C-alpha cells in the first residue's frame, strides 16, 4: 500500500530563562527513525532506527545543519506570534509543525503536507493541491500573503513531490525488513464471570504493525456497541501496537458474539468466537 514520511516539530518558549525547547522527530509510517532535542547532549540529529544507521556522516551533518536551522526558525516564529497575538513576554507558548509526503503502491508521490499550529490551534496549512494556504484567522492571513508573495508553496511542493519522496523511497528500500513488513495482530479472546449470570468477553489484538486497526463486536451477525468497553490503540514499546475491546454478555450466550479484526497485515478480516 501507501507509505508516509512525516516530520513533527515542537518548539516551546521558556520565558523564565534561555531559549525555546525544540524537539523534532522523523517517522516513516509508525516507525521513528531520527530525533533532535535541544536539551540533549549531542546537538546532532540522532538515529532511532537501525536502518538509518547505514547513512554516513554527510547525511548526519546535513540533517543537523537543517534541523538546527528549523530550530532557529521556530524560535523566531514564537517571537513573531507573540507579537501578532499581543501576548506578554511572560507566558510560555507553543509552536507545532508537521510536514511530509506519502507514496502510493506504485511508489510514486501521492500526497504532501505542511501544517502549523500555535498554542495547540490551527494556524496555517498547505492545502491538498500544494499550491495554496488555509489560514485559520486574520493573523494567519499575514503569513498567507507573505508566503504567496514569496512563492513558498512552489518551493515546498518541489520538495514534497521531489526530494521528499526520493528519501522515502530510499528509506523503504534500506529498511525493507521492517518498514515494508506488516505484523498481523495476534488475537485471542478471554472470558471472565462478573456474576453468576453474566460474563465479560475481551478480544485482544497484540503486537501488530502498523497501528491502524478495527476491532468490533457482533451479536448474531450484527454490530453491537451497547455494553462494550475498549481502549485506544497503544504502543507496546517494541515498535508494535496493542488494542482490546470487551463486551458483557449473559452467561450461556457466548456463542452469539463474535469479535472482528481488520488490519492491513490480514488478507481477510478475522472472526473470533469464544
Amino acid at each position: 500500500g501507501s507509505h508516509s514520511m512525516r516530520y513533527f516539530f515542537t518548539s516551546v518558549s521558556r520565558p523564565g530563562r534561555g531559549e525555546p525547547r525544540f524537539i523534532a522527530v522523523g517517522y516513516v509510517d509508525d516507525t521513528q527513525f531520527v530525533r533532535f532535542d535541544s536539551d540533549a547532549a549531542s546537538q546532532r540529529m540522532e538515529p532511532r532506527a537501525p536502518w538509518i544507521e547505514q547513512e554516513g556522516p554527510e547525511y548526519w551533518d546535513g540533517e543537523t545543519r537543517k534541523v538546527k536551522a528549523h530550530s532557529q526558525t521556530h524560535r523566531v516564529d514564537l517571537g513573531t506570534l507573540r507579537g501578532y497575538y499581543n501576548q506578554s513576554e511572560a507566558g510560555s507558548h507553543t509552536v507545532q509543525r508537521m510536514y511530509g509526503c506519502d507514496v502510493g503502491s506504485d511508489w510514486r508521490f501521492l500526497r504532501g503536507y505542511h501544517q502549523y499550529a500555535y498554542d495547540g490551534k490551527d494556524y496555517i496549512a498547505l492545502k491538498e493541491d500544494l499550491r495554496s494556504w488555509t489560514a485559520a484567522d486574520m493573523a494567519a492571513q499575514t503569513t498567507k500573503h507573505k508566503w504567496e508573495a514569496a512563492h513558498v508553496a512552489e518551493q515546498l511542493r518541489a520538495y514534497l513531490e521531489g526530494t521528499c519522496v526520493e528519501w522515502l523511497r530510499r528509506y523503504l528500500e534500506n529498511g525493507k525488513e521492517t518498514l515494508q513488513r506488516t505484523d498481523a495482530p495476534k488475537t485471542h479472546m478471554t472470558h471472565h464471570a462478573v456474576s453468576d449470570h453474566e460474563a465479560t468477553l475481551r478480544c485482544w489484538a497484540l503486537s501488530f504493525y502498523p497501528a491502524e486497526i478495527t476491532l468490533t463486536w457482533q451479536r448474531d451477525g450484527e454490530d453491537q456497541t451497547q455494553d462494550t468497553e475498549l481502549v485506544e490503540t497503544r504502543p507496546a514499546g517494541d515498535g508494535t501496537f496493542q488494542k482490546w475491546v470487551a463486551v458483557v454478555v449473559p452467561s450461556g450466550q457466548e456463542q452469539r458474539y463474535t469479535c472482528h479484526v481488520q488490519h492491513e497485515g490480514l488478507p481477510k478480516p478475522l472472526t473470533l468466537r469464544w
Binding site: 516530520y7 522523523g26 547525511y59 546535513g62 540533517e63 537543517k66 534541523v67 536551522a69 528549523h70 526558525t73 523566531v76 516564529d77 513573531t80 506570534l81 510536514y99 502549523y116 494556524y123 496555517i124 503569513t143 508566503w147 514569496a150 513558498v152 518551493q155 515546498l156 520538495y159 526530494t163 521528499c164 528519501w167
Partner: peptide
C-alpha cells in the same frame, strides 16, 4: 531527510 527551506511566519 529534512526540507532545506523552512520559511518564517
Amino acid at each position: 531527510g529534512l526540507c532545506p527551506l523552512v520559511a518564517m511566519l
